[PDB]
Amino acid sequence: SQVFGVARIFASFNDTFVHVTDLSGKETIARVTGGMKVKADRDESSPYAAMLAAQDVAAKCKEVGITAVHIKLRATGGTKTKTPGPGGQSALRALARSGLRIGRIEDVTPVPSXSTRRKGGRRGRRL
RNA sequence: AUUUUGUUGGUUUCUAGGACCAUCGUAAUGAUUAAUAGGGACGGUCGGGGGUAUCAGUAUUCAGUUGUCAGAGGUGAAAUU
Ligand SMILES: [Mg+2]
Ligand SMILES: [Mg+2]
Numbered sequence: 001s002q003v004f005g006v007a008r009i010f011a012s013f014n015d016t017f018v019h020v021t022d023l024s025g026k027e028t029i030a031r032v033t034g035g036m037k038v039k040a041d042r043d044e045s046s047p048y049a050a051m052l053a054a055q056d057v058a059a060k061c062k063e064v065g066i067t068a069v070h071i072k073l074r075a076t077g078g079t080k081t082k083t084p085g086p087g088g089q090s091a092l093r094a095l096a097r098s099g100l101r102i103g104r105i106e107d108v109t110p111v112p113s114x115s116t117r118r119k120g121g122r123r124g125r126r127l
Numbered sequence: 128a129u130u131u132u133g134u135u136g137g138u139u140u141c142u143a144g145g146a147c148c149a150u151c152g153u154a155a156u157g158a159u160u161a162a163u164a165g166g167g168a169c170g171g172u173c174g175g176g177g178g179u180a181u182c183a184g185u186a187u188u189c190a191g192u193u194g195u196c197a198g199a200g201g202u203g204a205a206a207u208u
């Protein structure tokens with residue numbers, strides 16, 4: 001029936017990656033980041049830039065034959081935040097509205113089972 | 128050792144007092160509770176109590192292979208990178 005890729009969306013609080021691979025993930029089909037759509041660093045992670053990034057990904061996906069994708073959303077994870085960035089919700093909605101078909105959706109944020117020391121010091125970063 | 132038998136002094140048994148030694152007889156013969164103090168034992172437990180080994184887990188970083196291609200990072204905004 002459909003031809004599935006995997007839309008690996010990495011939405012941090014400084015950028016948004018829309019990366020579509022095959023099922024294995026060893027073959028990259030399209031990787032458009034929110035920073036390729038704006039000329040200001042402060043909104044590389046904006047919802048607007050993620051939507052534009054996803055639309056360019058969907059157009060590239062169509063001409064290769066990818067008709068559906070699975071979604072693997074992730075945040076920065078590790079010792080840093082586990083909540084997804086603001087661009088991850090827009091890139092997901094843009095892909096669904098671009099004619100691409102959606103399969104399984106999963107959060108694949110890396111989560112430690114403890115962990116290493118997190119940056120900032122004992123008193124945190126004082127603002 | 129007072130006292131003799133007094134004519135004065137020697138003799139060692141009764142004697143009395145210890146002080147002990149054995150036997151026998153008397154006797155209701157002789158050991159306070161177990162502290163809602165403690166200690167100890169014992170019986171099933173219960174704990175992220177300790178020590179010595181041992182076995183996970185993802186994460187972080189670094190490296191190897193792969194894939195694409197222009198940015199990535201970081202911030203209130205940036206720049207160093
Ligand atoms: Mg400092
Ligand atoms: Mg303050």
Ligand SMILES: [Mg+2]
Nearest residue numbers: 161162164165
């Ligand atoms: Mg008692």
Ligand SMILES: [Mg+2]
Nearest residue numbers: 168169170171
């Ligand atoms: Mg015991």
Ligand SMILES: [Mg+2]
Nearest residue numbers: 171172173174
């Ligand atoms: Mg019980």
